[PDB]
Each structure stands twice: as structure tokens, then as C-alpha cells.
Amino acid sequence: TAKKFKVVTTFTIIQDIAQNIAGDVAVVESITKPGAEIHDYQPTPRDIVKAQSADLILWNGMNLERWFEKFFESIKDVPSAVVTAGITPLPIREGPYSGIANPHAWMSPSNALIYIENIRKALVEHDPAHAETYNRNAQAYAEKIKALDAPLRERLSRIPAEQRWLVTSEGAFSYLAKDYGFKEVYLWPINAEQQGIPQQVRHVIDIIRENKIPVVFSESTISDKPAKQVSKETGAQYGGVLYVDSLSGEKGPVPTYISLINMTVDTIAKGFGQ
Ligand SMILES: [Zn+2]
């Protein structure tokens, strides 16, 4: 066991999924830090160093990392793999990014199984000496992710279907909402230029009042102020922060992908009174 195979990912969700597949034969690090906004992140010379010292680079694609392709052009002789191949996208509904794939596909546990398979294939291709380990670790982790879906689905099924309105800041939950039958309301369709401008806030407020939706949420990498303004003006409580674009730090309450899905579902369910 000389030097461990080095994997660099764009963001933290992919870091943790890949690290479960890598086990003890590879070390996986994220370019973005926990809590950092990932869509419009501005890479630094230090990020170039980290990616250039890697043996493999993993990214989401599907219009997530607006910075990645320009950044990767500075990197020489390091293979990359997009981890979302084979996932059917949901289009973004409105705004200047309307009609392109919504990148947040990892919020569906079923889609996470495809992330796992794509990461496994990339590690086996670029580090074939450890293929048996990657295959073993991917099978075990896929078992955990597959089993995760049933209790989450049952928990959210307790909310009456007519009342299943998921009101968030970024429209980052479209894949989770599809899986579990929630209608989707948001202050902005995807992180970008305008987040909480008028017109956006007014539309969400109107839907909340028309349907008597009991709760609204924010997310861990963006401002909570728009959601709190919406809750102040309506009958909805502020349900707290959902985790989608980043894990917490490893000593925080959301250290892993499994913890992120569980925490987000638990926070939604509690917002609805379980
Ligand atoms: Zn996002």
C-alpha cells in the first residue's frame, strides 16, 4: 500500500458518496468547503493545485457547477467523470435557466443509486488495481441507500397528499418532490443572480395563503432572510434549514450524504407536524 489513489470532487455530497465507495484504498476531497455556495463558486489558484494533484476528478454536470469546465481546462493529464450519466433530468420551470436540467438529482435516493454506479465505474476504470474493493464497497453502500428509501417514503406519506406543498428558497428539491409526491413552490428556481427579489416573494406568498400551507424552508448555503420574510407575512411557520447543496462539517449535524437525506426529510416532516 504505497500512496492512496487521490480523488477530488467538486462539492461535498459527491465527496461523501465517493468516499464510501473508495473505502480505505482512496482518499476523496471536495474543492468546495462545507457551507459554501456551489453553483457560482469562484475557484482559486489553491483549488487548481488540489485538482492538479488528483488522480481522478468527479463532477455533477447537469448545469450544477457553472465554474467547472473553465476550471478543468487548467488541469493537465487528470481524468474526469460526470457522475449523473443515466439519470433522467427534470427541467427547470422558469427564469433565465428555464428548460435546462435541474442539477439537484442526488435528492432522490433512487437517483443516488445511479450516482453510486457511475462513481464505481470511474474508480474501476482509472484505478483498476483496486477494482474488487470498489465493487465490494459500492455494493454495500448501495444496499444502505436502497434501504433508506422505504422509511423516508413512509414518513412523508403521513402528510395528506393534498397538503404536500414543499415551499423552499432555491427550487433545489424537485427530484425529492417528484419521488414523494409534493407540489413544489420556491423563491428562486436555481441559485444565480436574483434570490428573493419582489415578484418572486409575492408569488410564493399568494400560493401559501391560497392553500394554507403551514411551513416554508431555507437551505444551508443561502440566506434565510427571504424565507423568514415569507413566514412573517403569512400563516406559515419558518421550518428551518434543509440541506441540499452541502454537508455540514464532519463535526456538525449533517456529516454524510445519508445524514443529509435523513435530516432534510425529518425537517420537512416536523414542519408538517410529523
Ligand atoms: Zn442548489
Author numbering: 38 to 311
Can I see the authors' text?
By varying the protein-expression conditions, we observed crystallization of YfeA in three crystal forms. In this report, the lattices with edges 42 × 52 × 113, 62 × 66 × 67 and 55 × 67 × 82 Å will be referred to as crystal forms 1, 2 and 3, respectively. The high-quality diffraction data enabled the resolution of holes in aromatic and proline residues. The inter­atomic distances of site 1 ligands are 3.0 Å ≤ x–x1 ≤ 3.6 Å.
YfeA is a polyspecific cluster A-1 SBP that is important for Y. pestis infection and transition-metal homeostasis. Biochemical analysis indicates that the Yfe system transports manganese and iron, and complements their respective transporters MntH and FeoABC. At the arch of the c-clamp is a tetracoordinate canonical site composed of His76, His141, Glu207 and Asp282.
